[PDB]
Amino acid sequence: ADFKFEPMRSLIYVDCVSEDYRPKLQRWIYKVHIPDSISQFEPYVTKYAFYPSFPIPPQGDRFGYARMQLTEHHWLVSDLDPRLEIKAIAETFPMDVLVWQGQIPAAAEGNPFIFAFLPMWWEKDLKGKGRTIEDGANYRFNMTIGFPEGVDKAEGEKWLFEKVVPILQAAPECTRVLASAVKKDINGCVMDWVLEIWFENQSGWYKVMVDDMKALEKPSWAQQDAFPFLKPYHNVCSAAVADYTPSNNLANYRGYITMR
Amino acid sequence: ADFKFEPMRSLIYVDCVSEDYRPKLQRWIYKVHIPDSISQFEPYVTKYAFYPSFPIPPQGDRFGYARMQLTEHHWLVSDLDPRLEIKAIAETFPMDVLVWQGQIPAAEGNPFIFAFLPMWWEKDLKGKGRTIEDGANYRFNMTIGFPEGVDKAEGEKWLFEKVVPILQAAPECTRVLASAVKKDINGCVMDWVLEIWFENQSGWYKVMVDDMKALEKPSWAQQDAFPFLKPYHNVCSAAVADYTPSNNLANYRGYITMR
Amino acid sequence: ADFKFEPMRSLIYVDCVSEDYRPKLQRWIYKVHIPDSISQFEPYVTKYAFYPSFPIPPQGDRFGYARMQLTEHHWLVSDLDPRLEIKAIAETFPMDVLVWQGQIPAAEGNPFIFAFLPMWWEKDLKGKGRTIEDGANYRFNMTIGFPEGVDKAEGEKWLFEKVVPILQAAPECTRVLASAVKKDINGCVMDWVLEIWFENQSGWYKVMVDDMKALEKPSWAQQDAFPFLKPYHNVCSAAVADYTPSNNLANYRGYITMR
Amino acid sequence: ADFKFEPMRSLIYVDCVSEDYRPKLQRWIYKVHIPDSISQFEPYVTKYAFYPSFPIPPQGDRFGYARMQLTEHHWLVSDLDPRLEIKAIAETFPMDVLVWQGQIPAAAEGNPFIFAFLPMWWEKDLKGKGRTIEDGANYRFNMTIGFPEGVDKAEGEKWLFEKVVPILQAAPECTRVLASAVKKDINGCVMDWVLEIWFENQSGWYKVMVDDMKALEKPSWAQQDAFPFLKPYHNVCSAAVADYTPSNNLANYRGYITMR
Amino acid sequence: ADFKFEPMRSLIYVDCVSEDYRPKLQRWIYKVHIPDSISQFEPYVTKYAFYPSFPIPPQGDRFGYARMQLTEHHWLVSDLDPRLEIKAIAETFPMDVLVWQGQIPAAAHTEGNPFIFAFLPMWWEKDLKGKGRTIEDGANYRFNMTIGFPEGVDKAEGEKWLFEKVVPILQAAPECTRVLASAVKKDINGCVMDWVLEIWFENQSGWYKVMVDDMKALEKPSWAQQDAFPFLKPYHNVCSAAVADYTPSNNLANYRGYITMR
Amino acid sequence: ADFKFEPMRSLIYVDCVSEDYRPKLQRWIYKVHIPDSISQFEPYVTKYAFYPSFPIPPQGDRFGYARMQLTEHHWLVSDLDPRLEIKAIAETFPMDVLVWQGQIPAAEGNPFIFAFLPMWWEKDLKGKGRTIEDGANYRFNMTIGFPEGVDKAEGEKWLFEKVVPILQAAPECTRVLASAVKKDINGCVMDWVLEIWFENQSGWYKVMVDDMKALEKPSWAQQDAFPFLKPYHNVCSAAVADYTPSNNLANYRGYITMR
Ligand SMILES: O=C(/C(O)=C/c1ccc(O)c(O)c1)c1c(O)cc(O)cc1O
Ligand SMILES: O=C(/C(O)=C/c1ccc(O)c(O)c1)c1c(O)cc(O)cc1O
Ligand SMILES: O=C(/C(O)=C/c1ccc(O)c(O)c1)c1c(O)cc(O)cc1O
Ligand SMILES: O=C(/C(O)=C/c1ccc(O)c(O)c1)c1c(O)cc(O)cc1O
Ligand SMILES: O=C(/C(O)=C/c1ccc(O)c(O)c1)c1c(O)cc(O)cc1O
Ligand SMILES: O=C(/C(O)=C/c1ccc(O)c(O)c1)c1c(O)cc(O)cc1O
Ligand SMILES: [Cl-]
Ligand SMILES: [Cl-]
Ligand SMILES: [Cl-]
Ligand SMILES: [Cl-]
Ligand SMILES: [Cl-]
Ligand SMILES: [Cl-]
Ligand SMILES: [Cl-]
Ligand SMILES: [Cl-]
Ligand SMILES: [Cl-]
Ligand SMILES: [Cl-]
Ligand SMILES: [Cl-]
Ligand SMILES: [Cl-]
Ligand SMILES: [Cl-]
Ligand SMILES: [Cl-]
Ligand SMILES: [Cl-]
Ligand SMILES: [Cl-]
Ligand SMILES: [Cl-]
Ligand SMILES: [Cl-]
Ligand SMILES: [Cl-]
Ligand SMILES: [Cl-]
Ligand SMILES: [Cl-]
Ligand SMILES: [Cl-]
Ligand SMILES: [Cl-]
Ligand SMILES: [Cl-]
Ligand SMILES: [Cl-]
Ligand SMILES: [Cl-]
Ligand SMILES: [K+]
Ligand SMILES: [K+]
Ligand SMILES: [K+]
């Protein structure tokens, strides 16, 4: 049977729940996970990249801040096609990785693995159209949200656009707003939206995403007292990243060369 | 909604209208334009290459000769899909680029010619079976668009029944390939892209200038001699080599400057 | 017209019929064939790799053992689409290559076996979940095609109900994978591709020679022992490693010679 | 005249004095500084790499912790040879870079530029000889020190190797100790030693470098009350880094590709 | 015996004497010469690059203008050490290449131009104008020129002329943004050239204004081999190229074989 | 203190004493040894390459034939300088590697042969001027060390006045190169490295076995026939191709596994 041409960009929000885990998690990612991954999908993934998160900002924990990285893939086919379950070589994946990323708690309950599929192009351009790289360095705050069980999706959308987006648009500190609807049909991801919101720096982020958002009234479905009113790491995940990453893995990886 | 699998090769004819602009245009292309471009389409363009033009030959001006390069992309999806208009980072594009390439004057402006094609040539009209072992080629790539109110079928008939026979008769011409432009993608005025190979500039001239004097002047002619089309508007061209070092998705390592 | 999205993995079984031909065949493959191939299909082939065969094992000749390599491509479109027949530059292909690989004699010629598959194995029959951490594999890749007038369904039933169970039972065998050949693409005579992993040559021999002695000789047998198929015509194979340095779209930098 | 074969490894300790500067400094480093640098020394530098610092640990400020990265070069000739002062193209260097790194304040004192030359091979192997990458992920604490004005160098050396290093050796948390003398003859660097001290993690670092070092008595020349007893960023600089960096710039750099 | 550490930058001035030869010469360079060269010196050459020449400017012929490229190597050891003459695989080098480049004439009837291979230190010895120029300051038209004074001209006198008569005209011209110079290492391979200069402009017009028009003010030296600056015999005592800041042909990093256009 | 500029090429003769060890040895070399090595010497080694050996020829065992590969390094400094003994990260080195290569048995082990040379061959004795255009070479690289108490000058005289003239006379032999081993670096027992080219295995055998029967057996002979030296102890060799894909500082991208 045929395989469908299904170009998509996916994002995984990778946390590191303790600094003591960082060397181990980082080693697994770069030493073990990259080659396993390329080995499997080189023929049908056109880009595979890691975007290390900037230092967690103040109150970033309330946004499900990924303290390790964003993992980004560009697919030509759906990885959730059941035919793609068969692999000559399976990935080397210690259960410890789940501890390091917080999927399993210190045994807190655990945090889910958030793997959001999107179209390759942003669906909505809500602020900053025409911005070039010449305009300067961006503090790029990528955030995914999923409305809690039994909140009507259209009602969540209405909240987002009526209440939240206008505050982003109004803030001179915010230079760019982009959004896409999560493709729910692919893997049953709980998230509904991915937004990217750019600032000049952490202080700008905080002014807008913490101080300006104090004006919002608390929705009836709120799972925390303040914006984003969603349960950290379960219904909201995020990372602040730079414009550039050296970890463009299909082009740039040359093995796990160690420092002398 | 779905995105359609639309594998295509595109060619852009990049001129440099004065030698005094060459350093600036070349810098923009290699220093600024490459990274902006790769940044945008790395996931759905499988090849992105520049083919620097050989020195403009005698009477090359009459063929809309691109004095900088051909720019070549291989796409997996149509770039003219409206959904692809949204970009996180837009390209850095000074207005001066338009002057350098001759789109804007600083007597008359020339259009930006961006022709989409299938990835494989539709017609193989001479030289089938030629290998790289057979020698170095002077590859004359030429695109033409018939003027307003010329029946396309009539233009096609002229091309294939009058023009190509002259190419076939010349032993100096080693290869003829052609494809119809995909006009449905971006409204390009051009109708055909041909590639015509010679051994060298003198062969090109003997055939494309001297042998073509035998053609009679069509009624729609916009100039007295072949190609009878308005330079840079209804005909563009470049002569290029078999190989380019500028295979940008594989070969680019930043704008390293000479010491 | 449209081109169909047709992701496929293909395998070619490349023999070297005499050791005296090995330097010449290897030179052609790496010096001439790689650049010709990349030149043609860079935009619509996502991976192009050679897997050198391990030394031919005892009785390997009876399995149509490829003494040079497996050649592997990953395609986004069918290479047998008639539109893909047209190429600006054709491959440089000396007739001697056919001699070296045994397609023609300098007793009897062997066919060119080019099998198209889906990119993912259809059947996982032993060893699901094996990781690279579990150790080095001796990977025996084997393709078979039932002789003329053997019912395909009957051959399939034999393969999966008689042959594969012997593989499954052997502790020496760590992995069994299989896919049906896509016969609709290029008319390949082969019906199945299997990959069967061992620890080493001795394990391969214990299972593929000694354990297979238990099989009844089918009525259609073309040789007395498993695989009961005519070497190089109805069975081809190679044993290869997990890794190859010849990942050609990523790793090739020209034919640099030893000092 | 001849050029001397002078193989050396150099380290630069690159700070970022405010989180608000991080995007700008990081952009300059990766977008502007890399190509300028490669352009100049590609023919006589065999390796050029950046090692991003792990998050600053508790009390890391007291160690002159470089909040951006270590910059590492391997030279075949001395960069301080006066003939090497001439360059066709000079580096693009906004004065703001000095602000971002803390060399100058915002329009005697910011912090000096610390550029330490070493031999390519560590001179002293004081703990953990034989360690392989198979033995696990390392938290690699690289630290350079320079004794203050009018402290006898031999006396400082004796203190380092007879008082400080024994505490490192006694700690099971410390898996590796390496040291080299700074080549002072190259560029007049104030630093005298570079050490690298490995731990499993941040907690190990802190247990040893803060808690175990409380047992040291305060030298007469001390410029702060606790180990390392040297003035942060002036007489001590440091960074904790991983075994691997994706920023192996002579091999891995493909231009400043921006995230979509 | 020991090999001496001898870091050097070399330049070869590669001409193409007819446009009809360009496809063949270019094919040889990129298809045959690159891999042969890398095969030989990968272990002791740290950079190998080609800088294609800009279109020959007006009166460029009088400057021994190389119509193909500059070839640039960075050596760790002297290639003229006699021990380096032995090579497992020798370069494939048809005598036709010499025709294409103008070293020999095309066909026996009843001199061409010499091969100019100049060794330099890796760093310019003299920075005479434009110190501190960055890439941010804009695109350069980089005119690289090598000169060798004719037989029986005192070298010190030639030097004094160069630096005290010629360079001041460059200094006075606002069109000229950079002047760099090094003495040729004559001890390596007996090259006739004495100096390599690089002189930067914004563009061809600037080059011409300065190197042709402003130089008309020079008086003609007694040793002159032509009436106008540079007063030296084209291709024999003067060679040159105008090149860009950047080349895609950084061959040790960038070469992936002779991939042909579709 | 200073480090001396000491440009050298070194060769290591890597055997594989049983086919059952080949997957494991090959995995260690490509998965573990490459990154460990690059990690250590990237800043002062300009080239690091593996040349896989062709199949062992008839009687190749008598020449200490390396059944895995030649390992080749180009150094800027002496790796045997005692200061280079200190390394942040030591190589991961299972003792089994010594079994696989035959240094240790599962009576007698074979030594590790690591020969340092100048980067350029000292003697060109046949085939000067041969280019890659002249064809594919079967390159037989052989190192020899005269036994204890044989005068070195006498061995040299034998090599160059008795052995090499047989190579010179044979039309099957297209190239002879030789260098003296640098004994001062690491105490290597070997005295010479030669490379001797043929067209193929048959040519190798005709010359190195049949033509060498004419030599009289030296008094110091450790075996009856040429090379008259103890296999793997006083003679080691490999036949290799002109090209290797394993140019490790340029070409390595991690241990990507076959699908
Ligand atoms: O990036 C991760 C990853 O493996 C994604 C992925 C790729 C291919 C698949 O078939 C698939 O199901 C998932 C990733 C990561 O970056 C960190 C982790 O802990 C786990 C991951 O899967
Ligand atoms: O090649 C050019 C180019 O930018 C093509 C292109 C790329 C991405 C798109 O989305 C698109 O619509 C077009 C190009 C060039 O080479 C020179 C120029 O002056 C302008 C160009 O666009
Ligand atoms: O791999 C080979 C190859 O060329 C396959 C192929 C590609 C495109 C086509 O149109 C086609 O018909 C075949 C290959 C090889 O690896 C070795 C050979 O000797 C010949 C080959 O074709
Ligand atoms: O490492 C930096 C740097 O400037 C190095 C250097 C190398 C060679 C020279 O001749 C020279 O003058 C300087 C560096 C860096 O890597 C990051 C920064 O943010 C600032 C730096 O100076
Ligand atoms: O690069 C060229 C070249 O041949 C250099 C060289 C190297 C070693 C030698 O011993 C020697 O004599 C020369 C070169 C080129 O790149 C292009 C040309 O057109 C001509 C050249 O010589
Ligand atoms: O390449 C090998 C190797 O390790 C060489 C080497 C490097 C540095 C040293 O200090 C040293 O003593 C040796 C190598 C190989 O390629 C295969 C092997 O089996 C063993 C090796 O050492
Ligand atoms: Cl913590
Ligand atoms: Cl586990
Ligand atoms: Cl900025
Ligand atoms: Cl709360
Ligand atoms: Cl749809
Ligand atoms: Cl019109
Ligand atoms: Cl008619
Ligand atoms: Cl006209
Ligand atoms: Cl259709
Ligand atoms: Cl044989
Ligand atoms: Cl049959
Ligand atoms: Cl049976
Ligand atoms: Cl039989
Ligand atoms: Cl690549
Ligand atoms: Cl801060
Ligand atoms: Cl002080
Ligand atoms: Cl204090
Ligand atoms: Cl000496
Ligand atoms: Cl400019
Ligand atoms: Cl003269
Ligand atoms: Cl004159
Ligand atoms: Cl590289
Ligand atoms: Cl065996
Ligand atoms: Cl051959
Ligand atoms: Cl002995
Ligand atoms: Cl014997
Ligand atoms: K204390
Ligand atoms: K004059
Ligand atoms: K004998």
Residue numbers in the entry:
A (entry chain D), D (entry chain C): 1 to 107, 130 to 282
B (entry chain F), C (entry chain B), F (entry chain A): 1 to 106, 130 to 282
E (entry chain E): 1 to 110, 131 to 282
Authors' description from the paper:
The bacterial chalcone isomerase (CHI) from Eubacterium ramulus catalyses the first step in a flavanone-degradation pathway by a reverse Michael addition. The overall fold and the constitution of the active site of the enzyme completely differ from the well-characterised chalcone isomerase of plants. The quaternary structure is a hexamer with D3 symmetry (trimer of dimers). The tertiary structure of bacterial CHI (polypeptide with 282 amino-acid residues) is separated into a catalytic- and solvent-exposed domain, both with ferredoxin-like folds, completely different to that of the plant CHI, suggesting that the enzyme activities convergently evolved from different ancestor proteins.
Crystals of native CHI and CHI_H33A were soaked in the substrate (2R,3R)-dihydroquercetin ((+)-taxifolin, Protein Data Bank (PDB) three-letter code DQH) and X-ray diffraction data were collected. The electron-density maps of native CHI soaked with DQH show a complicated disorder in the active sites. Clearly, this structure analysis is not the doubtless identification of a distinct molecule in the active site, but more of a snapshot of the enzyme at work. The C6-C3-C6 framework cannot be clearly identified as one of the possible substrate or product molecules. We see two electron density bubbles at the positions of the A and B ring, but a gap for the connection. This can be interpreted as a superposition of substrate, intermediates, and product caused by equilibria on the reaction pathway. The observed electron density might be caused by alternative substrate and product binding in the active sites, but additionally, the reaction intermediates, the chalcone and the di-keto-tautomer, should be considered. Initial crystallographic refinement was tested with each of the four molecules of the reaction pathway. According to refinement statistics and electron density maps, the final model building and refinement was performed with the taxifolin chalcone, which marginally turned out as the best. No additional substrate binding in the active site was observed.
